[PDB]
Amino acid sequence: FDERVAEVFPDMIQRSVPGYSNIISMIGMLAERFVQPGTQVYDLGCSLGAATLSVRRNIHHDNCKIIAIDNSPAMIERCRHHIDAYKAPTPVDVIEGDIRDIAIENASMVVLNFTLQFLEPSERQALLDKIYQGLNPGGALVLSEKFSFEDAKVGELLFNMHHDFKRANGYSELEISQKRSMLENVMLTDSVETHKARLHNAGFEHSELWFQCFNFGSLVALKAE
Amino acid sequence: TFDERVAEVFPDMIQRSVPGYSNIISMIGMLAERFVQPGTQVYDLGCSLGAATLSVRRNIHHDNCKIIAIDNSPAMIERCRHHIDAYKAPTPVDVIEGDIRDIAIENASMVVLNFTLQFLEPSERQALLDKIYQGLNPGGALVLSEKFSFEDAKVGELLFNMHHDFKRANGYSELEISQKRSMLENVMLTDSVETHKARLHNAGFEHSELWFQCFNFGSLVALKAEDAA
Ligand SMILES: Nc1ncnc2c1ncn2[C@@H]1O[C@H](C[S@+](CC[C@H]([NH3+])C(=O)[O-])CC(=O)[O-])[C@@H](O)[C@H]1O
Ligand SMILES: Nc1ncnc2c1ncn2[C@@H]1O[C@H](C[S@+](CC[C@H]([NH3+])C(=O)[O-])CC(=O)[O-])[C@@H](O)[C@H]1O
């Protein structure tokens, strides 16, 4: 099963997460502006390195490193092989491990691309605090998540739109689909208001949504210079 | 002639300068599938060449609907009527040259303001949103897509820079019209998401939320209650 998820992951995420590919492209554009020479980037919950490779293709400074981490050995196996397929001047530390345990040092950029929802709600403040402290001045965090909505009528609409999206995209063709819809119904999501409040609570002077499509989106958080 | 020249290059100009525009058009069509009711009207306000109109129309599977597409640019209208006439569908379209500040909104299951409100003076915007709310049937939807400003200036600067990079990646400046249209864009006054939501609330919408965003451009959906008077 973890290998099966790892095998199909790109196609699964494409068919289930509206705007994913857009976010990944925007992550690259941000990297081009925010990765400073001699600094590092963290990809927290890296899966197969989709965000890592997007950053990496947009770093043209010397002496950087990306640190990519996932606690799934199936994802890590495959991410290390996938990253070895592409040539670039920035090396990557692919580390199998727990994001709640790893230190964040000298970071011009941090990426939580559909990863925070996997922690228990009560552990989410403490990861964000750490990322904040670990970011250099002027550094950026990207936080992409499935959102819940406090207005139940809007929530219903967006749930329906998401369902229509999955239908349009042949989501049910995937063998793994039944077990992934089971995960989504068991997952604990937060609202944008909740995400913003936690970011501010971590120390972030600036945060805003920079992407949304239906019930999925991404915030950018900026540490003052 | 600037009018005719914009209309001629419009699809490419919008594609190179509005991030998310095609995504929004697709979302509009999705929303139409669920929201357009038999025997009702849809309004496309500031229709340009009819892109939003055609997206809705392709997603209407019910009888006795009508779409009303309105713009006050003669060059946009002429081409929009021709563009609509080029595609077969059961739902008819009234293509009207006129001002959306003047037009009545009746029996509407859906109304679309896809990059149009920004072209009115700020002091005209509330009145138009009030009229839309009143003219929507209960359960109906407004789509409001805009270039936003940001109340946090550091975020605003960032998203301004990202928009710049987007236009550069897409060769926007290849277009002869780009210099003049960039300038005219910097003259129309944009509002924050907070302002948009406040306006929607004060027009009477019981529910509203951002449903799309990409950098400094995005889209709100606003719903009239099913039990509304
Ligand atoms: N505590 C944890 N520590 C480390 N990894 C974890 C933990 N909990 C979950 N994971 C890992 O977080 C990843 C989530 S996926 C990220 C997409 C990727 N970012 C992408 O941009 O393509 C999105 C999804 O599957 O919805 C999985 O690979 C888990 O192994
Ligand atoms: N007061 C007015 N009354 C009527 N029309 C107006 C008025 N003011 C401006 N317009 C018209 O509003 C349209 C704006 S475009 C709309 C895109 C379209 N919705 C699309 O989804 O492709 C976006 C852009 O030009 O950036 C133009 O066609 C104007 O002539």
Author numbering:
A (entry chain B): 20 to 244
B (entry chain A): 19 to 247
Show passages lifted from the paper:
Uridine at position 34 of bacterial transfer RNAs is commonly modified to uridine-5-oxyacetic acid (cmo5U) to increase the decoding capacity. The protein CmoA is involved in the formation of cmo5U and was annotated as an S-adenosyl-l-methionine-dependent (SAM-dependent) methyltransferase on the basis of its sequence homology to other SAM-containing enzymes. Mutations in the cmoB and cmoA genes result in accumulation of ho5U and mo5U, respectively, indicating that CmoB is involved in the modification of ho5U to mo5U and that CmoA is involved in the modification of mo5U to cmo5U.
Unexpectedly, both molecules of CmoA contain the novel derivative S-adenosyl-S-carboxymethyl-l-homocysteine (SCM-SAH), which differs from SAM by the substitution of the methyl donor group (R = –CH3) by a carboxymethyl group (R = –CH2COOH). The negatively charged carboxylate of the carboxymethyl group interacts with the positively charged guanidinium group of Arg199 through a salt bridge with a length of 2.7 Å. CmoA has a Rossmann fold that comprises seven β-strands and eight α-helices. There are two molecules of CmoA present in the asymmetric unit that are related to each other by a noncrystallographic twofold rotational axis. In addition to an antiparallel β-­sheet formed by the β6 strands of both molecules, there are additional interactions between helix α6 of one molecule and helix α2 and strand β6 of the other molecule. Together, these interactions comprise 15 hydrogen bonds and a number of hydrophobic interactions, suggesting that the CmoA dimer present in the asymmetric unit may also represent the oligomeric state of CmoA in solution. Superpositions of CmoA with the 5-methyluridine methyltrans­ferases TrmA and RumA show that the C5 atom of the substrate uridine is neighboured by Glu164.
